[PDB]
Amino acid sequence: MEYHVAKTGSDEGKGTLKDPFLTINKAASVAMAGDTIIVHEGVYREWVKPKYKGLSDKRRITYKAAEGEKVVIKGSERIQSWQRVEGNVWRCQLPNSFFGEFNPYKEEVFGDWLLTVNEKKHLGDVYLNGMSFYEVTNYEDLFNPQLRTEVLDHWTQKIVPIKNAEQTKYVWYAEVDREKTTIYANFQGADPNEEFVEINVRRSCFYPVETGIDYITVKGFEMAHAATPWAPPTADQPGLIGPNWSKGWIIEDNIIHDAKCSAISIGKEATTGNNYRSIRKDKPGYQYQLEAVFNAKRNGWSKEKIGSHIIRNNTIYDCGQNAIVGHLGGVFSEIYNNHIYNIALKREFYGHEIAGIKLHAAIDVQIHHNRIHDCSLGLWLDWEAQGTRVSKNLFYNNNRDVFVEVSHGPYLVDHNILSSEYAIDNMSQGGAYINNLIAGKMNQRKVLNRSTQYHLPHSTEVAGFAFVYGGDDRFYNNIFIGKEGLENVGTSHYNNCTTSLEEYIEKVNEVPGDLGEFERVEQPVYINKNAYFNGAEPFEKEKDNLVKKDFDPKLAIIDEGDEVYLSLQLPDEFENIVGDIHSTKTLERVRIVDAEYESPDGKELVLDTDYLDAKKPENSSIGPIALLKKGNNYIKVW
Amino acid sequence: MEYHVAKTGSDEGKGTLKDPFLTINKAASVAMAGDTIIVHEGVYREWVKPKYKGLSDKRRITYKAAEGEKVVIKGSERIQSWQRVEGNVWRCQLPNSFFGEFNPYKEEVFGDWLLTVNEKKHLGDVYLNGMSFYEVTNYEDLFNPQLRTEVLDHWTQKIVPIKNAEQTKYVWYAEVDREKTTIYANFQGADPNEEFVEINVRRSCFYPVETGIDYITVKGFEMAHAATPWAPPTADQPGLIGPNWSKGWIIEDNIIHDAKCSAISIGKEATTGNNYRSIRKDKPGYQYQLEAVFNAKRNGWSKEKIGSHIIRNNTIYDCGQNAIVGHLGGVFSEIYNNHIYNIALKREFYGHEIAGIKLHAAIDVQIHHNRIHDCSLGLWLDWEAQGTRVSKNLFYNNNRDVFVEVSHGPYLVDHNILSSEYAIDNMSQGGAYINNLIAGKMNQRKVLNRSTQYHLPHSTEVAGFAFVYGGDDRFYNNIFIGKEGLENVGTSHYNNCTTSLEEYIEKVNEVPGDLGEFERVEQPVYINKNAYFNGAEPFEKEKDNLVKKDFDPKLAIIDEGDEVYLSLQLPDEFENIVGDIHSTKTLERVRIVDAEYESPDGKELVLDTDYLDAKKPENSSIGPIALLKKGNNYIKVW
Amino acid sequence: MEYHVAKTGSDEGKGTLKDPFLTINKAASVAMAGDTIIVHEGVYREWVKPKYKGLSDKRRITYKAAEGEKVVIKGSERIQSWQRVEGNVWRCQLPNSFFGEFNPYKEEVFGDWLLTVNEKKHLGDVYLNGMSFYEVTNYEDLFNPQLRTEVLDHWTQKIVPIKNAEQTKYVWYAEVDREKTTIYANFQGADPNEEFVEINVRRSCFYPVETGIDYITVKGFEMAHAATPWAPPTADQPGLIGPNWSKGWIIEDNIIHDAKCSAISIGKEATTGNNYRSIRKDKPGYQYQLEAVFNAKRNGWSKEKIGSHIIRNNTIYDCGQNAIVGHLGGVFSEIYNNHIYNIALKREFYGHEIAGIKLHAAIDVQIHHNRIHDCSLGLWLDWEAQGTRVSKNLFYNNNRDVFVEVSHGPYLVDHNILSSEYAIDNMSQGGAYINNLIAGKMNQRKVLNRSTQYHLPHSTEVAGFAFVYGGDDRFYNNIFIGKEGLENVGTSHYNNCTTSLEEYIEKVNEVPGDLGEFERVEQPVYINKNAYFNGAEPFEKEKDNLVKKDFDPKLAIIDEGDEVYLSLQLPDEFENIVGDIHSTKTLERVRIVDAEYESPDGKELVLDTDYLDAKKPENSSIGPIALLKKGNNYIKVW
């Protein structure tokens, strides 16, 4: 059945093209496997709750915007009952019943790993012609807000410009008592009843209220203004849109923005753990997170039931926690061709769950061909990045590009452009960085007081757990570019590491013993055929490399809106380093997990296509794009 | 069917009382669920391999000695083909075919955690009228062997007397080439052909060659001389007798001795891990042990399939590694009324798997009413001692009594007599020490570089894993007794600890954060109503105790063979410290595992019966025996 | 923390004794493990939703009525806005918001195995001074309703008296439109605004809205009027009160009544299956139920996570489907000392899920010491009654007492009084009926077209599945009593069965083959020491029995309200038939499941205590009560 939803419809209608339903949730309450719901032009202010599940990729339930029509799903409501209080501050009041069980003005940003606990923030928001406001703590703070032009990036502790400085003068404050919700905001001279002013109302826009609602496709919508809660790996992780612990969704061709915390969630649900560290306070979130993995396994977390979602061709921006988030629920998924930007720039709250894309237990997840910029952190893989492949992505203008935390691999980062000044936080082992352009520092550190799970290959089955001893990383064919005032760019980090698993084994076994003898030897690294320019420094034992400290590539990423260009100068010697095509055969297995770098289907993996998807020759130049050459390079990269 | 085996029988017979079989293995080849095998007087030199399984506790297969008859199963053979070489050294030679696939003279003591790797030892042995020999390395060492009267205890590094000094002059040496096995031994003047001289030949005496041969009862036999291999938790763990990965065996009323390494094994089998650290050398046994736990879980390691064995009323002695050993295969078992002694005293080899009783993953195992003495270590619970209860046992004359390593509990040690000078090695957390007599030091240490699993209660399901932060131990109603020249007796080890989970939580939560804030605070301890004499020192914050540093109890354990007495003096003030009856209600839950102390069936546990099984009132003497009182005390304890 | 709720309280208060909350759900939203919620006198019209879970039996969350106070939780609301329409029919109108998401007047009795599909019924109800009404189909049916004094019992197809005939004249009919709900009812002359008139409004009274809220105790309340939905094993199974897929609840000392369908549910939740046969219509519920078992196993259905609930000392009555219901969620539970009556007597709807107590997969469930009467079916065990023990219960005045369907056992029915004319529906195998008094017929039938799961003992692990071939039943020490006209009372049903597993094996193996050879031989029965009076007939091969067809015991159950008595005459020959004490040793294992009859803890079971809990000697009267003897007997049985 093909159901139609249109603003000329009625929920008492049949739902056909001639007699369409009026609300999307009406269609969502009757559609069954194999049906399609076509939504016509309009703004739908509702939270769509798919009731029945698709049954296979062929028998999906597909929700899509009518061809060529603009369809918007919003969690907000326009408010035109404001009254001027004094100056540029106005007030509106609503019955608590307006919000039902979930009131964003009462609900706090709360939970494990939220670090800004002194200044409470709520899930509400106010918008003036689409522009969100900054919450203030006290009523008095509304009247003379101060324009701010720079802000401290929490992780890097660097003061950086505020992209939209004017926005800092637009503030809101609210109170909720037993009967009413009262919201105040400074509109800086505008009349909020005349302009288009909206406030957050609902938690989500498109999200099932039962788990297991598999095989849903959502395509072609603009979705916005969702009062989503702080979403750590140890709690339920609702988003503006998400599968809610199920399998086989396809979220594509959507424009998603203004989610309070996370926009798209492929995370977990509450029964396997819900902020126990913050609520019970007896054990840390570290301890509760490793327990949640086993709780989920007992609840059937496996390839057969969870994951394998596809998030593609979406534009996601202006979210406070993440464009994409999720612990466990994203295993085996694919995330590609997305444009993600402006994630967590307002910094109204901060904690260890913020990033353009953040995934815990991203088992065999493929993240490729994404454009990620203007984020405080572009990508964060945190725990169980086993089989994960981050390939052909464009990262620029971020405070940090990539962070792989407490993972054991085998994980692959290949053919990417990591152009920000702080490129990589590496608190893992078992990685392979192949054919990337890396123009920022790498902070590499062991993690000896946190042990985390590893798995059997291509599975959620747990094989063991380990601390991060550091090293056991591969680096081949990368172009590293340092910068005056920037330290730790390159691979010198591994200077005390062994150079093969054979060497590591021989050294460990010189003196009889067990764990202590292994701990006294540094793990092996496999590093060759990299170039180091402008101050980047190499692993001292690297056999074949190109080091030109006085050569300045003058790298620039030029963002012209829809198109992006890479400008780079390379030395004549660039052409002298010939990279090999890497594959399962060329990449040494990781030590602890004892697994190879392969495709998700268990077959041999060959890294023979570059950033531009060009087939790579056996004898190629290094870096992410085969066509780079000595001299000037001006390449369209998006 | 009731089958009979007798030395007047024939394996071609029917196996009836009037027409019995000749070998026990013949009966083992035909008995089925519900059958009984009655063995008549004689020495049966064979390895019995139960072929079919029992099907329930009611439909077991029972192997037993005929009432009032002496039945012996031996893995050795008597040798009467010795030829004098020179002096007191004699030689015999056997075809390699005599040993089949397993030749003790070629097989080495080998494997993970074996520490004495410079001096190779083998699994063979030579006996003169029942007394085993000491192996020597070179042919030359045979002729003028040196009498030794003292030996260094490896763990304590203390020089101690050799119990049987004369035995140190009886040595053997062997060679195995492509065709023959040649054995030499110094008989110190005796004629080995006239005397009764035996050599090890077979690996085991009563052990299935397939796994899953459940519900077998083995009763009333003497079994001896088994060339058993080194049995770490990361390898196959065969023993002289054992269930070989199955459920519901009852091993009772047997006299077992002279197993090279371990006597009774309720351990694991090879498919879940087999000395990978020693063979592959890429990861430590630590890493391979935690993996074996998950490997076993996939192989069905659960209450439904493995464990629940009973080992009771046996006498086990003169073994080189353990009287009872086992990783995983012993879950939910009961070990009681056994007399275990002389374990690992020869010290021909040493490593971290030696103890009278050693169990890894002793989940809900009950070890009670056992007499354990003259061992280098009486009991070692290593990993996953969750729900384990060590109750009413008698430990004396051991270099060390108990070791609980890298466990999280809740584990209970109650109403025991730990009378050796080094009583406890505590490298765990989550313990409850209740109503014990402790007369030796405790070495308590954190283990921050090894994390180990914990489980859901009364189950093999894994709930998480953790390192050992130290503390979170309870000590109530114990009588501690120090000694001059002995440090660390008592509970002063915990002076820096918090005193309640509420205090710990309050301190940890003083400043926002996660794991780091928890690690900065010491775990709570629950200590009260203990007495400290002759040098023992108390936890400084203990509220109610009795400390008389100068009072000497003059503790003595008098072993008269079949009977054992306890002699002890107590001060008049002893009448003034009264112990409470502890129970699930009175014992605070352990922090990390978040579980209570209770019975294996999930019911509340009340510790109201003492070492002598006397029911005691709410107000009673502290210590293991309610009869103890001020003044002189002379109690039969065995 | 001990929270207090009272009608003089405030949900803005601290929740203390002096400053108590006003609503129970307020306390339910803040209580945490270890806390107690004490509710003071009053009628609380709300659905209590426990938010946090208890963590162990010691750390439960307890909700209880203040001592000696009458506390009622109702799902209804009193209506005093009625307007007379004509004659004795009145009408009230409520905006749909009064009901919110769940409107009983819109919701139908619907789902798998509902058989009365031509006459639609809804979940609403109207009460006049506590007496519920009968729904009618059309507006016109309200005006001159007909008094009915008899009704057809659907299963037995017997016309029986309607207990409360006057109630049949009180009818209601409702109309729900886009804005409001209009309810009409005939009050037969009373003024509904002056009398106490209530209507159903909420679905449940005390039931979590998240699964996994373990270890809750609910005690001392009266709870009533819940619009609960039809609850088959293939759908979500909400009730008036229930644990909603969790472990360790204790529901005790409550008076529960007027649940539309099921009152106490220890059933399953939606994700494992939700009326797929009725909604998708591609496969039968039979097929979807066996799938739900595997779906639940994947979701953690096991003793570690689900079940082990205790339902005791409650009075439950006037429900349309069951007093207690549940598929899967009740494993390992205990149901005792409950008084259940008046279940499904109005017969407004009928289907295959109706019974006083109905449980699917009642693994190791103990149902004992309950009084069940005036039900259309007293107890229905349906699939996987493995380890179930129905002991010492009192059944009378039921159209049918017990139904054990498509189960393989071993299940035990001992020491019960089954006094209704149709005592047993036996569509299973593997049962043991020991020491019962059975005064009605047994309908025993094979089920060759439905195969159902069996398990490993004391576990939810699946071992296999089988059809019901019939037989493999044990009958020992029962007193059977026929009645003029009543057919099939006794054990003659099994006349062509074999008498031992040895005989069965011998006959099947006469000619080579597989399944077909087994299907042609009747399974064995183990029947001895039973008495047959007043027309009951014995198995023709029973060795020792007492048959007196012309003796009439004149059995009567005398219900005096709070006490119930059994009157029975027995012949002098009753003294000469002596019953044996049955136990795990005496009861032959069941054939297909290959398991013994034992206690849930795996220990031997000994059936040496009678209905009155008297320990009996080796030689005792047969039947359920050792006090019964030749002559007149008048015994208190409740």
PDB file of C-alpha atoms in Angstrom, chain B residues 426-593:
ATOM      1  CA  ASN B 426      44.984 -11.506  49.884  1.00  0.00           C
ATOM      2  CA  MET B 427      45.259 -10.028  46.376  1.00  0.00           C
ATOM      3  CA  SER B 428      41.509  -9.599  46.018  1.00  0.00           C
ATOM      4  CA  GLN B 429      38.567  -7.520  47.201  1.00  0.00           C
ATOM      5  CA  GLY B 430      35.038  -8.467  48.284  1.00  0.00           C
ATOM      6  CA  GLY B 431      35.935 -10.948  51.001  1.00  0.00           C
ATOM      7  CA  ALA B 432      34.209 -11.650  54.344  1.00  0.00           C
ATOM      8  CA  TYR B 433      36.399 -13.283  57.047  1.00  0.00           C
ATOM      9  CA  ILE B 434      34.055 -14.342  59.860  1.00  0.00           C
ATOM     10  CA  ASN B 435      34.749 -16.221  63.087  1.00  0.00           C
ATOM     11  CA  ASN B 436      38.138 -17.597  62.141  1.00  0.00           C
ATOM     12  CA  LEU B 437      41.211 -18.307  64.275  1.00  0.00           C
ATOM     13  CA  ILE B 438      44.043 -16.632  62.299  1.00  0.00           C
ATOM     14  CA  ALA B 439      47.560 -17.187  63.650  1.00  0.00           C
ATOM     15  CA  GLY B 440      49.796 -16.002  60.834  1.00  0.00           C
ATOM     16  CA  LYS B 441      50.431 -12.960  58.745  1.00  0.00           C
ATOM     17  CA  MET B 442      48.382 -11.622  55.893  1.00  0.00           C
ATOM     18  CA  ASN B 443      50.034 -10.166  52.833  1.00  0.00           C
ATOM     19  CA  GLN B 444      47.363  -7.877  51.278  1.00  0.00           C
ATOM     20  CA  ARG B 445      48.087  -6.205  47.935  1.00  0.00           C
ATOM     21  CA  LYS B 446      46.251  -4.316  45.200  1.00  0.00           C
ATOM     22  CA  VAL B 447      46.525  -5.698  41.615  1.00  0.00           C
ATOM     23  CA  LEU B 448      46.172  -2.777  39.236  1.00  0.00           C
ATOM     24  CA  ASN B 449      47.510  -4.285  36.030  1.00  0.00           C
ATOM     25  CA  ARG B 450      45.293  -7.384  35.795  1.00  0.00           C
ATOM     26  CA  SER B 451      41.530  -7.111  35.331  1.00  0.00           C
ATOM     27  CA  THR B 452      39.482 -10.318  35.766  1.00  0.00           C
ATOM     28  CA  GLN B 453      35.881 -11.285  35.276  1.00  0.00           C
ATOM     29  CA  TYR B 454      32.978 -11.146  37.678  1.00  0.00           C
ATOM     30  CA  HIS B 455      29.593 -12.737  37.057  1.00  0.00           C
ATOM     31  CA  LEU B 456      25.863 -12.558  37.505  1.00  0.00           C
ATOM     32  CA  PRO B 457      25.059 -14.301  40.852  1.00  0.00           C
ATOM     33  CA  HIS B 458      24.938 -18.142  40.908  1.00  0.00           C
ATOM     34  CA  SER B 459      25.861 -18.311  37.267  1.00  0.00           C
ATOM     35  CA  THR B 460      28.739 -18.521  34.805  1.00  0.00           C
ATOM     36  CA  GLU B 461      27.225 -15.568  32.859  1.00  0.00           C
ATOM     37  CA  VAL B 462      29.835 -12.784  32.753  1.00  0.00           C
ATOM     38  CA  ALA B 463      28.744  -9.450  34.189  1.00  0.00           C
ATOM     39  CA  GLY B 464      31.954  -7.469  33.811  1.00  0.00           C
ATOM     40  CA  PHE B 465      35.616  -7.456  34.808  1.00  0.00           C
ATOM     41  CA  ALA B 466      37.689  -5.369  37.126  1.00  0.00           C
ATOM     42  CA  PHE B 467      41.151  -4.804  38.595  1.00  0.00           C
ATOM     43  CA  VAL B 468      41.708  -5.204  42.334  1.00  0.00           C
ATOM     44  CA  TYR B 469      41.723  -1.809  44.109  1.00  0.00           C
ATOM     45  CA  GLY B 470      42.144  -3.423  47.551  1.00  0.00           C
ATOM     46  CA  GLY B 471      39.852  -3.346  50.522  1.00  0.00           C
ATOM     47  CA  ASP B 472      36.095  -3.878  50.417  1.00  0.00           C
ATOM     48  CA  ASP B 473      36.721  -6.720  52.897  1.00  0.00           C
ATOM     49  CA  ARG B 474      34.811  -7.629  56.108  1.00  0.00           C
ATOM     50  CA  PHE B 475      36.453  -9.051  59.230  1.00  0.00           C
ATOM     51  CA  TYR B 476      34.164  -9.903  62.181  1.00  0.00           C
ATOM     52  CA  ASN B 477      34.633 -12.155  65.215  1.00  0.00           C
ATOM     53  CA  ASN B 478      38.109 -13.325  64.349  1.00  0.00           C
ATOM     54  CA  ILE B 479      40.822 -14.175  66.848  1.00  0.00           C
ATOM     55  CA  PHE B 480      44.213 -12.984  65.515  1.00  0.00           C
ATOM     56  CA  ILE B 481      47.444 -14.274  67.049  1.00  0.00           C
ATOM     57  CA  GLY B 482      50.851 -12.890  66.127  1.00  0.00           C
ATOM     58  CA  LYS B 483      54.268 -14.273  66.969  1.00  0.00           C
ATOM     59  CA  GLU B 484      57.645 -12.718  67.712  1.00  0.00           C
ATOM     60  CA  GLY B 485      59.537 -12.286  64.441  1.00  0.00           C
ATOM     61  CA  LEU B 486      56.269 -12.102  62.538  1.00  0.00           C
ATOM     62  CA  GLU B 487      54.862  -8.934  60.995  1.00  0.00           C
ATOM     63  CA  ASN B 488      51.528  -7.980  59.442  1.00  0.00           C
ATOM     64  CA  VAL B 489      49.220 -10.172  61.526  1.00  0.00           C
ATOM     65  CA  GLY B 490      45.777  -8.628  61.987  1.00  0.00           C
ATOM     66  CA  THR B 491      43.870  -5.957  60.118  1.00  0.00           C
ATOM     67  CA  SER B 492      46.101  -2.854  60.344  1.00  0.00           C
ATOM     68  CA  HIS B 493      46.634  -3.379  56.599  1.00  0.00           C
ATOM     69  CA  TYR B 494      43.493  -1.374  56.026  1.00  0.00           C
ATOM     70  CA  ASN B 495      44.304   1.761  58.011  1.00  0.00           C
ATOM     71  CA  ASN B 496      43.849   4.111  55.039  1.00  0.00           C
ATOM     72  CA  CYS B 497      40.425   2.668  54.083  1.00  0.00           C
ATOM     73  CA  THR B 498      36.971   4.229  54.446  1.00  0.00           C
ATOM     74  CA  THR B 499      34.618   2.526  56.922  1.00  0.00           C
ATOM     75  CA  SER B 500      31.321   2.284  55.082  1.00  0.00           C
ATOM     76  CA  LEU B 501      30.089   2.358  51.521  1.00  0.00           C
ATOM     77  CA  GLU B 502      28.274   5.600  52.441  1.00  0.00           C
ATOM     78  CA  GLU B 503      31.599   7.191  53.423  1.00  0.00           C
ATOM     79  CA  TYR B 504      33.290   6.022  50.212  1.00  0.00           C
ATOM     80  CA  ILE B 505      30.466   7.391  48.049  1.00  0.00           C
ATOM     81  CA  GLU B 506      30.512  10.692  49.895  1.00  0.00           C
ATOM     82  CA  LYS B 507      34.278  11.127  49.482  1.00  0.00           C
ATOM     83  CA  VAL B 508      34.307  10.105  45.856  1.00  0.00           C
ATOM     84  CA  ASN B 509      31.535  12.434  44.981  1.00  0.00           C
ATOM     85  CA  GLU B 510      33.103  15.530  46.604  1.00  0.00           C
ATOM     86  CA  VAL B 511      34.316  16.704  43.178  1.00  0.00           C
ATOM     87  CA  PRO B 512      32.691  15.989  39.765  1.00  0.00           C
ATOM     88  CA  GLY B 513      34.396  13.358  37.634  1.00  0.00           C
ATOM     89  CA  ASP B 514      34.512   9.685  36.750  1.00  0.00           C
ATOM     90  CA  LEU B 515      37.041   6.878  37.203  1.00  0.00           C
ATOM     91  CA  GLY B 516      39.796   9.198  38.485  1.00  0.00           C
ATOM     92  CA  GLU B 517      37.654  10.407  41.380  1.00  0.00           C
ATOM     93  CA  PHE B 518      36.839   6.823  42.352  1.00  0.00           C
ATOM     94  CA  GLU B 519      40.473   5.735  42.193  1.00  0.00           C
ATOM     95  CA  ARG B 520      41.579   8.499  44.547  1.00  0.00           C
ATOM     96  CA  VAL B 521      39.458   7.090  47.420  1.00  0.00           C
ATOM     97  CA  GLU B 522      40.264   3.853  49.266  1.00  0.00           C
ATOM     98  CA  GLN B 523      37.457   1.254  49.322  1.00  0.00           C
ATOM     99  CA  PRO B 524      35.537   0.647  52.577  1.00  0.00           C
ATOM    100  CA  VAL B 525      36.281  -2.083  55.095  1.00  0.00           C
ATOM    101  CA  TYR B 526      33.784  -3.497  57.626  1.00  0.00           C
ATOM    102  CA  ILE B 527      35.762  -4.608  60.640  1.00  0.00           C
ATOM    103  CA  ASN B 528      34.520  -5.200  64.180  1.00  0.00           C
ATOM    104  CA  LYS B 529      34.537  -7.544  67.164  1.00  0.00           C
ATOM    105  CA  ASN B 530      37.971  -9.089  66.533  1.00  0.00           C
ATOM    106  CA  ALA B 531      40.624  -9.936  69.156  1.00  0.00           C
ATOM    107  CA  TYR B 532      44.348  -9.378  68.658  1.00  0.00           C
ATOM    108  CA  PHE B 533      46.953 -11.185  70.732  1.00  0.00           C
ATOM    109  CA  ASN B 534      50.679 -11.747  70.863  1.00  0.00           C
ATOM    110  CA  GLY B 535      51.609  -9.019  68.410  1.00  0.00           C
ATOM    111  CA  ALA B 536      48.616  -8.891  66.052  1.00  0.00           C
ATOM    112  CA  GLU B 537      47.595  -5.298  65.163  1.00  0.00           C
ATOM    113  CA  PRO B 538      44.070  -3.976  64.445  1.00  0.00           C
ATOM    114  CA  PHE B 539      42.596  -1.652  61.881  1.00  0.00           C
ATOM    115  CA  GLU B 540      42.994   1.681  63.670  1.00  0.00           C
ATOM    116  CA  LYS B 541      39.343   2.642  63.133  1.00  0.00           C
ATOM    117  CA  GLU B 542      37.815  -0.580  64.448  1.00  0.00           C
ATOM    118  CA  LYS B 543      35.153   0.404  67.005  1.00  0.00           C
ATOM    119  CA  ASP B 544      34.956  -2.704  69.229  1.00  0.00           C
ATOM    120  CA  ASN B 545      37.886  -5.001  69.672  1.00  0.00           C
ATOM    121  CA  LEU B 546      40.101  -6.670  72.203  1.00  0.00           C
ATOM    122  CA  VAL B 547      43.802  -5.976  71.915  1.00  0.00           C
ATOM    123  CA  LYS B 548      46.324  -7.624  74.241  1.00  0.00           C
ATOM    124  CA  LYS B 549      49.638  -7.433  72.433  1.00  0.00           C
ATOM    125  CA  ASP B 550      51.401  -8.943  75.347  1.00  0.00           C
ATOM    126  CA  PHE B 551      49.073 -11.898  75.830  1.00  0.00           C
ATOM    127  CA  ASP B 552      50.456 -15.144  74.456  1.00  0.00           C
ATOM    128  CA  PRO B 553      47.766 -17.774  73.632  1.00  0.00           C
ATOM    129  CA  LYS B 554      50.388 -20.516  73.339  1.00  0.00           C
ATOM    130  CA  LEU B 555      48.465 -21.919  70.387  1.00  0.00           C
ATOM    131  CA  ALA B 556      49.315 -25.528  69.485  1.00  0.00           C
ATOM    132  CA  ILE B 557      47.861 -27.995  66.978  1.00  0.00           C
ATOM    133  CA  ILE B 558      48.555 -31.524  68.189  1.00  0.00           C
ATOM    134  CA  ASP B 559      48.414 -34.068  65.374  1.00  0.00           C
ATOM    135  CA  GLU B 560      48.140 -37.589  66.771  1.00  0.00           C
ATOM    136  CA  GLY B 561      47.470 -39.251  63.420  1.00  0.00           C
ATOM    137  CA  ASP B 562      43.769 -39.933  63.087  1.00  0.00           C
ATOM    138  CA  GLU B 563      42.926 -37.310  65.682  1.00  0.00           C
ATOM    139  CA  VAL B 564      43.959 -33.678  66.027  1.00  0.00           C
ATOM    140  CA  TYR B 565      43.681 -31.374  69.020  1.00  0.00           C
ATOM    141  CA  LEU B 566      43.784 -27.651  69.499  1.00  0.00           C
ATOM    142  CA  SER B 567      45.450 -26.275  72.669  1.00  0.00           C
ATOM    143  CA  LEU B 568      44.880 -22.608  73.413  1.00  0.00           C
ATOM    144  CA  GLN B 569      44.989 -20.148  76.320  1.00  0.00           C
ATOM    145  CA  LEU B 570      42.634 -17.133  76.325  1.00  0.00           C
ATOM    146  CA  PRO B 571      42.582 -14.035  78.611  1.00  0.00           C
ATOM    147  CA  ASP B 572      39.811 -13.287  81.059  1.00  0.00           C
ATOM    148  CA  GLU B 573      38.891 -10.332  78.912  1.00  0.00           C
ATOM    149  CA  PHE B 574      37.886 -12.851  76.253  1.00  0.00           C
ATOM    150  CA  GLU B 575      34.544 -13.174  78.040  1.00  0.00           C
ATOM    151  CA  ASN B 576      33.884  -9.475  77.453  1.00  0.00           C
ATOM    152  CA  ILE B 577      33.979  -9.422  73.649  1.00  0.00           C
ATOM    153  CA  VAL B 578      30.815 -11.005  72.235  1.00  0.00           C
ATOM    154  CA  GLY B 579      30.329 -11.970  68.608  1.00  0.00           C
ATOM    155  CA  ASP B 580      27.173 -11.403  66.578  1.00  0.00           C
ATOM    156  CA  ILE B 581      25.641 -13.998  64.252  1.00  0.00           C
ATOM    157  CA  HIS B 582      26.453 -12.734  60.750  1.00  0.00           C
ATOM    158  CA  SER B 583      24.213 -13.313  57.767  1.00  0.00           C
ATOM    159  CA  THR B 584      23.178 -11.987  54.383  1.00  0.00           C
ATOM    160  CA  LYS B 585      21.435  -9.181  56.272  1.00  0.00           C
ATOM    161  CA  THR B 586      24.498  -8.156  58.345  1.00  0.00           C
ATOM    162  CA  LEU B 587      27.174  -8.342  55.630  1.00  0.00           C
ATOM    163  CA  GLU B 588      27.371  -5.260  53.387  1.00  0.00           C
ATOM    164  CA  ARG B 589      27.205  -6.059  49.651  1.00  0.00           C
ATOM    165  CA  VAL B 590      30.507  -5.967  47.721  1.00  0.00           C
ATOM    166  CA  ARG B 591      30.918  -2.789  45.712  1.00  0.00           C
ATOM    167  CA  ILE B 592      32.039  -3.709  42.234  1.00  0.00           C
ATOM    168  CA  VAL B 593      30.126  -6.967  41.828  1.00  0.00           C
TER     169      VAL B 593
END
